[PDB]
Design a binder for this molecule. Structure first.
Ligand SMILES: O=C(NO)N[C@@H](Cc1ccccc1)C(=O)O
Ligand code: NI
Length: 183
């Protein structure tokens, strides 16, 4: 199983590289590392396993964060309210379209790879369409709004060497953009 030992930290140069596109089919090694990335998120969300193994709670993980410079992401967003849950292991995820209207978490964002908290709103697209492959090479198209769109944008950022804190207005960090939706 993966643990916080496996997650590299702000300053590691792998987090600032552009992740390489994967060829398909995936190698067994690649499937296994993507299943383990999901398993980490699952483990990080069980309070007993997470206490026992000192896991931070996470809803998304990009392979660069375990120092693998490949374009795979895991998202595990539990039901929490609506009936909408998100459980996705994506290969070569790409945002193909998005809203002009922005969205932000009113408390800013966190990062398993970031030991500090950073204050500041991170404005993202309220709505996105993603095309990607699943672990078996089949085609996935996601239409996402609000919380999940923000999480996926966070994870895809990692594949392009971008960190949540790069989006933070240096002067007015807690000023919401006009007509930006609060999630
Ligand atoms: O750090 C990772 N993945 O990179 N995952 C974040 C996801 C996230 C995104 C935006 C706001 C809050 C949280 C986490 O702490 O669960
Ligand atoms: Ni992060």
């Amino acid at each position: 199983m993966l643990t916080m030992k496996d997650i590299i930290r702000d300053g590691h140069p792998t987090l600032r590289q552009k992740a390489a596109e994967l060829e398909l089919p995936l190698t067994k090694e690649e499937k296994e590392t993507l299943i383990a990335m999901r398993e980490f998120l699952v483990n990080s969300q069980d309070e007993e396993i997470a206490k026992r193994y000192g896991l931070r709670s996470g809803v998304g993980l990009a392979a660069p964060q375990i120092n693998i410079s490949k374009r795979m992401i895991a998202v595990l967003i539990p039901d929490d309210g609506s009936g909408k849950s998100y459980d996705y292991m994506l290969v070569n995820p790409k945002i193909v379209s998005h809203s002009v209207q922005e969205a932000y978490l009113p408390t800013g964002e966190g990062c398993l790879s970031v030991d500090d908290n950073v204050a500041g709103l991170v404005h993202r697209h309220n709505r996105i369409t993603i095309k990607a492959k699943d672990i078996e090479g089949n085609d996935i198209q996601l239409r996402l709004k609000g919380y999940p769109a923000i999480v996926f944008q966070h994870e895809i950022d990692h594949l392009n060497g971008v960190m949540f804190y790069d989006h933070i207005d240096k002067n007015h960090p807690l000023q919401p953009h006009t007509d930006a939706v609060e999630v």
